[PDB]
Amino acid sequence: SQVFGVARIYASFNDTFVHVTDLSGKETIARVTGGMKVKADRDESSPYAAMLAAQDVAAKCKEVGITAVHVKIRATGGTRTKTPGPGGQAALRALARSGLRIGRIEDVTPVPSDSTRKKGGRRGRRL
Amino acid sequence: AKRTKKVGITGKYGVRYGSSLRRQVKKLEIQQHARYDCSFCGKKTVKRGAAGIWTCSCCKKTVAGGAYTVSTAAAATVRSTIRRLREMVEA
Amino acid sequence: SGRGAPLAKVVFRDPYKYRLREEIFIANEGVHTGQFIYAGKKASLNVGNVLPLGSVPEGTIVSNVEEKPGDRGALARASGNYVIIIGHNPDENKTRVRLPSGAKKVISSDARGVIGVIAGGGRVDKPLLKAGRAFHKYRLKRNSWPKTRGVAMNPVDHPHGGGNHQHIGKASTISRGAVSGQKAGLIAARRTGLLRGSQKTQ
Amino acid sequence: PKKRASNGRNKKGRGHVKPVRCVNCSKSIPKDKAIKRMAIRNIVEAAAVRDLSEASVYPEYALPKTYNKLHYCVSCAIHARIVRVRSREDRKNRAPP
Amino acid sequence: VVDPFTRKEWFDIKAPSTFENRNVGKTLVNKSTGLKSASDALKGRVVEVCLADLQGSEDHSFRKIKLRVDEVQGKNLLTNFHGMDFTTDKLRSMVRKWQTLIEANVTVKTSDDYVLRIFAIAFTRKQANQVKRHSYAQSSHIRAIRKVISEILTKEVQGSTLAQLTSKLIPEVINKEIENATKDIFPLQNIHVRKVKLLKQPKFDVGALMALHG
Amino acid sequence: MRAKWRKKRTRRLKRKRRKVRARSK
Amino acid sequence: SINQKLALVIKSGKYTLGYKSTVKSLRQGKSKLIIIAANTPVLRKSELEYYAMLSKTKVYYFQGGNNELGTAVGKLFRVGVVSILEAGDSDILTTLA
RNA sequence: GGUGAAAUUCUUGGAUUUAUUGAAGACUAACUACUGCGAAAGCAUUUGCCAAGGACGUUUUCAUUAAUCAAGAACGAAAGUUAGGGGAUCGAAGAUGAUCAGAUACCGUCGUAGUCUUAACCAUAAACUAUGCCGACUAGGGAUCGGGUGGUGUUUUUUUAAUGACCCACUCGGCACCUUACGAGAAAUCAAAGUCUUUGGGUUCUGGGGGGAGUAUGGUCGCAAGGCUGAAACUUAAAGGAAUUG
């Protein structure tokens, strides 16, 4: 009821991304989430780190000012596990709690019509 | 009786130049010598000479074509896409 | 004689005099005797006709394309060669196309081309099989055959000349800035060795 | 000898079934033999849904979730997901539970 | 500090005549100085607004919409139609095992020359007294249905303009305008108009876009 | 050794032996 | 198809094959329909069409060269034009053609 | 970025992210099942065309025209070979980064051939149901696919039928499952793997302790890689199967 934008959340495995932008698409945000406050190189996806960096995300969001925004979350997907990452939900929650208004949501995880064969061969990763 | 098991028309070259070179030649050789079917009269009377020139014995027409076959794969595919791009400029 | 692709003699009326003028075109694959050819901007898109690159849509196939509007044919003239129109910039009225070499040059839309591909394609697929056929081939082009390997000559005859064994003796790649007399071998070669890979520019 | 009458899973009278590849290791596995689990997990958590709704527009309009079908490779399936190796006669029970 | 907070201007947008309310909100684009300025490089975007977001009760919440910005003047930024789509939640919830899916599409034009490919989605309905958990159709049915869907589909489009086209699918009765035909062939739960996507349009025609304001 | 590897070892072995007497062909 | 409706005229009615016989038919008016192969030249086409209009005879352009028209009329040779004089029971003189 | 963790790697070239957007080749997700089809290989977006096929239905026709089959032939996954095209993807090779005592690997990176398509080959897969085909007989059970029959069964309501979908009962042919054991089996198990010392419906094929060895040799097929046919000398007391206990 006050203002709108875009969330653009993305949670990979061993990294995660979050960045707002105008609902017109090209626009901008500040966008630095993944290995920004956490630098151990394996805690990149970690939820304790997703919030630590998502915090500074809402900061700039409100620094220039956006009260409400809807989400568009996306997993690495495409051709590798089509599923949310650890720091995906652990970030917008720390931000919805940051005094942010949300609403209509849907994910944009890319899924194909069974093509572009994956890595690892027919025997896959062996361990 | 069958005269040659494999050489066919390439037997003129005898034993020289290697089986591979001779074999591949026979391929284009067969094509450039055979009689094709004429598109303007319906009779198979169009033969080559002066590669890229295919003329019908009767009806006297001369068609430009591949060096060894009347229609080359590329030209045939072009005919298709030219029809496509053309059907696209009246309707 | 001396050309792989066949020629096409096309007769036209002289719009300024009661007289016939006979142009000599390169026969595109499919053209036939007694065919009707159309030439101009407001012409149809039929294989054989000649239209400016602007008047044709993307993906068209043309040969004997003009580098500049009105040079009577400069590109895609060898047996079975063609160029493809891959775009138009109606402002500056340019038209970007792909040549047989793969290079993508942009030229004026008023430049002309003939719909289709050149005839006599696939001539190079048949081996020559004997020096005689190569001999007769060049008997009509020029005195460029046969070729003596510079490594079989004495030093007085070539850089690669001389030696108690047949060898080049120094790098076969030669600088572009080289001088006439030393530019023999791989000139300005940016690479060398057997090409193993994609072999098609993106 | 055999230790299952299907010797795979769900395939009698077809010869060949297009193969799917495991979500965990990408290894190929025939669709008829791939253990399938549809993961319908919400955007929710224990204490994350209340913060989500109070300080927001749209006072709990839809609340949608994640929907995607997963296919595993028996080797991977046995490692983490539902394999739960059974007993000689307890395995013939196809009751999902 | 570069401080791109006081950086540029915010522009406004609304929606065409079709809907009840039209306030889109605002966006941020760039300084309007002419070196390479606004407008000439501005109206080439689109936004993702839900339908109930600008129409009303969410009895139309599934449908997502794209609005192609076309022309702008001093703080005007009005955007015409660009397409639509369903949402993962709805579609992924409609694809239930133990039933057969049906998808079909057609490419037509309206009068407002635009050639469009639409999409439709339908499933199988279990009869009230049914006892089989499979609830499946038969190829003869599925092919026949597609035909009537295709036939019906290219009636509204090429039957009116883009405006009435948008005004035709928002009531969604075409969804069951299929059902009267399918009621004689198969139950068919969840019959919809799931997606639409386009290619081009005649040149801008500045005068026609102004017939969506008031 | 593995079954299919014994095959490969044998296939190689015959290829080598095959070559060896073609020298005396 | 129409090859069917036409194939009944050879076994039932009267016809004439060939460019020359077909024109004497068009001059005497006995022709009610003439079939012209696809590959036949345009000059002869317009000529036959002229004679047809003079004999008020209808024409049908057979999609397929004279080779196809010949094997269609049951003959083993190219047929550039056919002129029907009596369609014994074929609806060819009454169908959409 | 990638992983268990890292590193080779990529980033004044604004990378990863976003936006509009185009190209290329590949694939058909979800729907998808103890579901369908084909001789097997094998077959999943649309539509048009091309011929083709089983089950059913049948008071139609022919009337033993058949069953099974050495020789011979049609097709035959994958990879692989020849000539074009294609070459997006993933990716033998190779080269790398990491690991390890070592690490030619597994994990990561690059990436050739390949992957795809046309024309021609090659003819092998745990090509599996590790289970010949035709015929008959023997046993209980509820699902399901296709055809069919039966109705003062429900729904569509239009105004009720006609229909269509659904319900029920039956019958023929399908893919299977379940419970039984008369019965079989060395057992695991099997409606055939049963109707066998109470041994005979028709017919095809193969096997005769383990190695040696699918080796040698001849023949033949193939461009090759290889396919098919296929020994012996010698050596050896076990090798093997299913089940039981540890």
Ligand SMILES: [Mg+2]
């Ligand atoms: Mg493991």
Ligand SMILES: [Mg+2]
């Ligand atoms: Mg000389």
Ligand SMILES: [Mg+2]
């Ligand atoms: Mg030389």
Ligand SMILES: [Mg+2]
């Ligand atoms: Mg020389």
Ligand SMILES: [Mg+2]
């Ligand atoms: Mg010398």
Ligand SMILES: [Mg+2]
């Ligand atoms: Mg010198």
Ligand SMILES: [Mg+2]
């Ligand atoms: Mg020198």
Ligand SMILES: [Mg+2]
């Ligand atoms: Mg020297």
Ligand SMILES: [Mg+2]
């Ligand atoms: Mg030398």
Ligand SMILES: [Mg+2]
């Ligand atoms: Mg075991």
Ligand SMILES: [Mg+2]
């Ligand atoms: Mg299987």
Ligand SMILES: [Mg+2]
């Ligand atoms: Mg198989």
Ligand SMILES: [Mg+2]
């Ligand atoms: Mg031993």
Ligand SMILES: [Mg+2]
């Ligand atoms: Mg020797």
Ligand SMILES: [Mg+2]
């Ligand atoms: Mg599909």
Ligand SMILES: [Mg+2]
């Ligand atoms: Mg014999």
